[PDB]
Design a binder for this molecule. Structure first.
Ligand SMILES: O=C(C1CC1)N1CCN(c2ccc(F)cc2)CC1
Length: 460
């Protein structure tokens, strides 16, 4: 039975509004309702992995697992295996997989982050799960960020705290946060970003939603505007939104948006908004294709509608050769030529690089680079032809061309990372000097760039 080179992944996010679900929620897992929906002809085809994020979830883990498993069994006639479940307060993540995947899945990690301080610590934050699927690392984050139209900067701060402090994936990747640890990272939840239009325009917005005219609303969506200004979710993707705002509904129908200020809302307006979102970030040149992104129309117990997204994702096999794992394969090598880092820092320490990859037996430290002053007042760190030749464990091009090298640029004085990035080995040619490039980030914000050339030798 062959190992897959693609899987499909279902991502669900639902703020349940502290109410139990209705008896039937199958529409969610079938990607049916509004937006980019799944074809009816696929209804019986199970996804490989289902990742369910809830917020304001009033159920026990046991109660929700029973509902999820019985839902999927009704759709697919398959009894899914529970990979992981993790709950912080009323924020929960469940990962389910087809039984045939049980011995393909390992290194399961869970963690949570509590956001805020004092007043603002106690109900917002994130949960996450990571694991290996054969040769591919997968990470999943469900976050419930700060509410309220006038708190976009708090939401951005919540995002930075979650990506700094959520401890998932390979702990040996010490310079890297979750935005670099995974082949594929999915980040979803009630992100709570609002449509920033005046309160007086509520009925106008409602009119536009009834006409299915979302363009003048999406141009004021805080998540899209903050992402375009590089304030949050740098280097993440989101499918185009083609479904109505998923908040705030009157319960037990979808015919009414409940936007007016009430004692129950702290006298805040809740203009119709796309609070409930799915974003992703995959390593360069790995296959990832969104095949659905939408909301259900028939699940009305909450003041939010459930959101679904599905993806094709490239995966690789657990490779064995005569040589690696457990030794190098002298027929393979990675050379970095004429490399330089450009950093936004004011610091004048010397810097060195670390190269991390699961194609190496362990990470590789470079010599210090040569600092020059850039024309427009930046730091340029030159490595020239001084970088260590990297010795992969396996030389087979079917393996090596699918790998990635994570790069950290670290201060010699403090050994702290000033920037992290990733280079694909999916090159146009081997034995050939080719340009490489990554942006560098630290705590998920842009700190610089790394560019130069690579020369990859495989056994072929
Ligand atoms: O406690 C252990 C022992 C290794 C320490 N496991 C629990 C999680 N396991 C799991 C794997 C795939 C899967 F799809 C579901 C569950 C198996 C391994």
């Amino acid at each position: 039975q062959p190992e897959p080179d693609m899987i499909t992944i279902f991502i669900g996010t639902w703020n349940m509004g502290n109410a139990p679900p209705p008896k039937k929620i199958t529409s969610w897992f079938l990607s049916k309702g509004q937006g980019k929906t799944r074809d009816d002809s696929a209804d019986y085809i199970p996804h490989d992995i289902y990742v369910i994020g809830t917020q304001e979830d009033p159920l026990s883990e046991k109660e929700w697992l029973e509902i999820l498993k019985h839902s999927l069994q009704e759709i697919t006639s398959v009894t899914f295996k529970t990979v992981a479940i993790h709950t912080l307060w009323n924020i929960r993540i469940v990962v389910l997989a087809k039984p045939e995947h049980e011995n393909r899945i390992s290194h399961i990690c869970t963690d949570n982050v509590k956001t805020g301080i004092a007043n603002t610590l106690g109900n917002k934050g994130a949960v996450g799960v990571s694991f290996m699927f054969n040769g591919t690392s997968l990470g999943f984050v469900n976050s419930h960020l700060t509410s309220g139209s006038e708190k976009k900067l708090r939401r951005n701060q919540n995002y930075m705290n979650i990506l700094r402090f959520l401890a998932l994936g390979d702990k040996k990747l010490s310079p890297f946060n979750i935005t670099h640890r995974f082949t594929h990272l999915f980040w979803f939840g009630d992100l709570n970003y609002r449509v920033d239009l005046p309160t007086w325009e509520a009925e106008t917005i409602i009119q536009k939603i009834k006409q299915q005219q979302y363009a003048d609303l999406l141009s004021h969506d805080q998540l899209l505007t903050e992402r375009r200004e590089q304030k949050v979710f740098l280097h993440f993707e989101e499918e185009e939104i083609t479904f109505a705002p998923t908040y705030r509904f009157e319960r037990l129908t979808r015919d009414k948006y409940a936007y007016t200020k009430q004692k129950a809302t702290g006298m805040k307006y809740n203009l119709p908004s796309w609070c409930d979102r799915v974003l992703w970030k995959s390593y360069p040149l790995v296959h990832v294709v969104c095949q659905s992104y939408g909301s259900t129309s028939d699940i009305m117990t909450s003041d939010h509608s459930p959101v679904f997204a599905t993806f094709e994702a490239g995966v690789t096999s657990q490779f064995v050769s005569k040589n690696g794992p457990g030794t190098v394969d002298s027929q393979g090598q990675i050379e970095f030529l004429r490399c330089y880092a450009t950093l936004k820092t004011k610091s004048q320490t010397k810097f060195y690089l670390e190269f991390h990859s699961s194609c190496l037996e362990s990470f590789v430290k470079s010599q210090e680079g040569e600092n020059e002053e850039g024309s427009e007042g930046e730091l340029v760190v030159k490595f020239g032809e001084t970088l260590p030749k990297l010795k992969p464990i396996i030389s087979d091009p079917e393996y090596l061309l699918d790998q990635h090298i994570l790069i950290s640029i670290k201060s010699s004085d403090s050994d702290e990372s000033y920037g992290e990035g990733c280079i694909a080995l999916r090159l146009e040619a081997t034995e050939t000097q080719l340009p490489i490039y990554t942006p560098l980030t630290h705590h998920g914000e842009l700190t610089g760039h790394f560019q130069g050339e690579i020369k990859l030798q495989t056994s072929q």
